[PDB]
Amino acid sequence: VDREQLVQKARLAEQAERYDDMAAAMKNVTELNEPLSNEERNLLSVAYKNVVGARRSSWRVISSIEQKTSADGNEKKIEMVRAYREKIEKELEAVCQDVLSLLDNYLIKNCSETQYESKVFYLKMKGDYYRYLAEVATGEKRATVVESSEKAYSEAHEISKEHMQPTHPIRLGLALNYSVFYYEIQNAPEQACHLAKTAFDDAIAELDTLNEDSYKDSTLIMQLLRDNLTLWT
Amino acid sequence: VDREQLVQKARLAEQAERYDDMAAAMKNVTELNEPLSNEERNLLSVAYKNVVGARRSSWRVISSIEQKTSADGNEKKIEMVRAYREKIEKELEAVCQDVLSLLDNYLIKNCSETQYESKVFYLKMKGDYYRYLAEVATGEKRATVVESSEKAYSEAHEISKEHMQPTHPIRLGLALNYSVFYYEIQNAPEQACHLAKTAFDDAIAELDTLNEDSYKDSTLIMQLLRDNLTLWT
């Protein structure tokens, strides 16, 4: 019931791979209104990434069955498939809204004007989980969560482009997901390519900035930025 | 609500890797009191094995940590681990009692005295989930489920030894889990290895007689019998 134990339960849940328990424990420590340490901050991101990832993976395979079996299949089986897809859809959207609530009410809110690292970390997460919502949305409900993802990504970009080094893994990771957001959600290959290229180039010019602690995390993201750039011609 | 839809729901949940949903669909198909076909029998077996299997891996990870923490005596971190262990423990035992009820009320009940193949399959399954109970039980509650696992395994063994060919994958796999029960649960290594080699020897004496269909299935379980022998000193 104590905060120090709640973080320990989340550590245990990750070892037991019960990410629903892990995300619930971190949801509690976030609700205590005390700021999150760098480690506790990564426990929350890992927990809800696994939870929303399980729903998103299940949603993708069911929706694929729903589309490829939407021509000839019996009217009774397709009514069972689309019913299962929407059940997963509501589960995904409920987890996303759960994350965006912690972000707007506790995490982004309790950030000072000088906490550019945590501000960019939480703002990128906001654009991430709004992007996950845009994958399963259609019509006017899609165009709004798309612009909410854009407002979260764009603000995280300006704070990162000014107050953080180009080799910082948080700044690099943001440019990755932001450029992915442009290519897959907005269908803007020209802008997605530009965003990923400048972030890679600016990190290359200051390659002599990597320390022994942050050399791994930064270099792999640069490779992923290259990998995504080769794919987009 | 229809049986053909319930089984198709279970196939969806398997592809979506939502084994909790899959076990619930096959529980409904079983609760219609109509005997289960071969395909529906394995859909139920696969679903609950994944459901109870995720709890077995989580319990083993947590109970391993509980052992290294009960020697330090932190008196505060140890109690939170035992709580998480017993939370997973109750989830595991609830899944087992759910399967054992389906076995006693529907599956074994609807087996005629001449349905030797199905009688061995379900009885072995009964000894299996009673053994899963024995892995997390203590005191006299353990010696109870150990005795229940023994009666189910032994009766399935006598039926298979009399009415089944030694190369039959059902009979071979029973000897595997029965020998595993002897070594790991009852700590009777003389009989665990006697059982494993007897079943392996008897199955080779007529291994020439089979088709290729009953060759890959038959031999794979035999390799497991060999692996267990080498790994059991």
């Binding site: 550590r11 990750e14 070892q15 791979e17 480690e39 990564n42 426990l43 991101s45 890992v46 990434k49 991430d128 990771g173 990755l176 997901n177 992915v180 290519y183 897959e184 993201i221 992923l224 990998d227 995504n228 794919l231 | 094995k49 299997g53 299996d128 796999g173 595997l176 889990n177 595993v180 790991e184 379980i221 497991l224 267990n228 790994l231």
Partner: peptide, 19 residues
């Protein structure tokens, strides 16, 4: 390469029978 976004797998330390 299917999901082109950023993975951060872990933040800690992440049969004998037939199956």
């Amino acid at each position: 390469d299917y999901d082109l976004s950023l993975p951060f797998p872990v933040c800690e330390s992440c049969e004998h029978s037939l199956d």
